[PDB]
A paper describes a structure:
The structure of the monomodular Pseudomonas aeruginosa bacteriophage [name] lysin [name] is presented and investigated in relation to repurposing its function as an antimicrobial agent. The structure of [name] shows that it is a one-domain protein with the typical α/β lysozyme fold.
The protein without and with PAO1 peptidoglycan was crystallized as described in Section 2. The best apoprotein crystal diffracted only to limited resolution and with somewhat streaky spots, but the best peptidoglycan-bound protein crystal diffracted X-rays to high resolution with cleaner spots. The apo structure could only be refined to relatively high, but not unreasonable, R-factor values, while the peptidoglycan-bound [name] structure could be refined to more satisfactory values. The apo [name] and [name]–peptidoglycan models have two and one molecules in the asymmetric unit, respectively. Molecule B of the apo structure is less well ordered than molecule A, as shown by the average temperature factors (68 versus 52 Å2, respectively). There is one amino acid with disallowed Ramachandran values in the apo structure: Gly32 in chain B. This residue has reasonable density and is near Leu76-Gly77 of chain A. Presumably, this contact pushes Gly32 into a somewhat unnatural conformation. The root-mean-square deviations (r.m.s.d.s) between molecules A and B of the apo [name] structure and between molecules A or B of the apo structure and molecule A of the [name]–peptidoglycan structure are 0.5 Å when Cα atoms are superposed. Buffer molecules have also been found in the catalytic clefts of other enzymes, such as the lytic CHAPK domain of the [name] LysK from Staphylococcus bacteriophage K or chitinase C (ChiC) from Streptomyces griseus HUT6037. They may mimic the enzymatic substrate or product, and thus their position reinforces the idea that Glu29 and Glu46 possess catalytic activity in [name].
Residue numbers in the entry: -1 to 186
The structure:
Amino acid sequence: SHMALTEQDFQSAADDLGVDVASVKAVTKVESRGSGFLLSGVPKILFERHWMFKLLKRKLGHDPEINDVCNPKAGGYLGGQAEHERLDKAVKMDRDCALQSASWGLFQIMGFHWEALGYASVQAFVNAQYASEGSQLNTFVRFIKINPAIHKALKSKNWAEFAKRYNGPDYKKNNYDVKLAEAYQSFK
């Protein structure tokens, strides 16, 4: 109920980035999934078995065993609470790699970014996904900071450049450059 973002959270992030409050609301409206939590109260995730293969391959120094939650071929997605059963299975192979191989919260940030984002450990990154949407928004803010090119675009309010660098070269297919601008106006 209170787990959802508030003006207090939007402003903390805006101040932390050093940008307009409406700019943070804009990207949150488009780049987020509305809620960063499922019904049970656990974070919204999507498990990437090909990242589980890559990360566990780096750790061991050889190919791991290929199953339905560890495979160099991307896909096999279930969805919602079902994704947490895939994570639980992957945790029994290797906890750190599994947790790192899922995208977490509002902005679906991959858990292997934990170190670049400046968290004490993998477990610190996860606890921040369980805490609140405000913490999940802090994670997003941290991702924007470590991408100066994307951070500058947000401050200069380019949208076209921000959408290109964040969403990908094929951003105009979903009208991200436009949606961001129209969203920005809806709050401004």
